[PDB]
Amino acid sequence: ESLWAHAEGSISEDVILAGARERATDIGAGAVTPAVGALLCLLAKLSGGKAVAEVGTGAGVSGLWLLSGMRDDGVLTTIDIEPEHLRLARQAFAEAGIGPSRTRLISGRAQEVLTRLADASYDLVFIDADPIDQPDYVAEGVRLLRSGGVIVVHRAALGARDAEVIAVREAARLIAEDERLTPALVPLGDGVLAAVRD
């Protein structure tokens, strides 16, 4: 527990991220912790960082962290059902100086958007929308990953009969039994499940 607090407390954020967090709490949208963000940046950088897809833009906190680990020519495709959240995220990306060609924001239900994105074309897929939908996102997410890509599920550790906890464990099951995936659970924020494809 002291180990966990030490890790969470390891990271400080700039004024842009602070502005994005303020907007996240106003709209009642979650936001990953700074230490989760640092991990997302590391994993984007390890993954190659050219094409990253995000399910659940929020106010752009996770997107800013992912972009700081991506290549200059990299494109973050981020998906949200709420146009208002997308507008706030686009503002944060603008305030950070992110070139407009490095982000592609898509308004809609991610269960439908993901099907339209090209198989084996993405270096990292980050899943951070409703946990009850994690199983659908994992099935579609894994298909988008090229060889050596990483799928990253936030809220991976969340009554043992709840419909939402059934979905989280069922998604962890999908990853644990997929022979093409090499996974590790990371106790940061609400819990991060990461897995590399073969």
Ligand X SMILES: C[S@@+](CC[C@H](N)C(=O)[O-])C[C@H]1O[C@@H](n2cnc3c(N)ncnc32)[C@H](O)[C@@H]1O
What is the C-alpha to C-alpha distance for residues 152 and 191, in angstroms, rounded to an integer? 10
| CA 78 to the chain's CA centroid | 9
The reply on whether position 79 binds ligand X by CB under 6 A is yes
Q: Which of 17, 19, 23, 32 binds ligand X (CB under 6 A)?
A: 32
Per partner kind, with CB cut-offs from 5 to 8 A, the member of ligand X, a copy of itself, none near residue 163 is none
Going from the C-alpha of 92 to that of each of 36, 60, 123, the distances in angstroms are: 18, 7, 23
Size of the site for ligand X (CB under 6 A): 23
Give me the least distance between CB of 9 and a copy of itself, in Å please: 9
CB-facing half-sphere around the CA of 19: CA atoms within 13 A: 13
- Please tell me whether 85 is known to bind a ligand: yes
Cβ-based nearer residue to a copy of itself, 117 or 192 = 192
Q: Could you please report the per-residue DSSP string of 37-93?
A: HHHHHHHHHHH-SSEEEEE--TTSHHHHHHHTTS-TT-EEEEEES-HHHHHHHHHHH
The reply on whether position 16 binds a copy of itself by CB under 8 A is no
- Please tell me whether 80 is known to bind a ligand: yes
154 in catalytic set? yes
Q: Within 162-191, which residues bind a copy of itself (CB under 8 A)?
A: 182-188, 190-191
**Torsion on CA atoms 24, 27, 29, 31, rounded to nearest 10:** 0
What is the C-alpha to C-alpha distance for residues 23 and 115, in angstroms, rounded to an integer? 30
The reply on whether position 140 binds ligand X by CB under 6 A is no
Q: What are the tokens at 129? A: 């929308």
Q: Which of the residues are catalytic?
A: 154
**Which spans of this chain sit near a copy of itself (rule: CB under 8 A)?**
1, 3-4, 6-8, 10, 35, 38-39, 41-43, 45-47, 69, 148, 150, 157, 182-188, 190-191, 194-196
| Site residues (vs ligand X, CB under 6 A) | 29-32, 56-62, 79-82, 85, 109-111, 128-130, 133
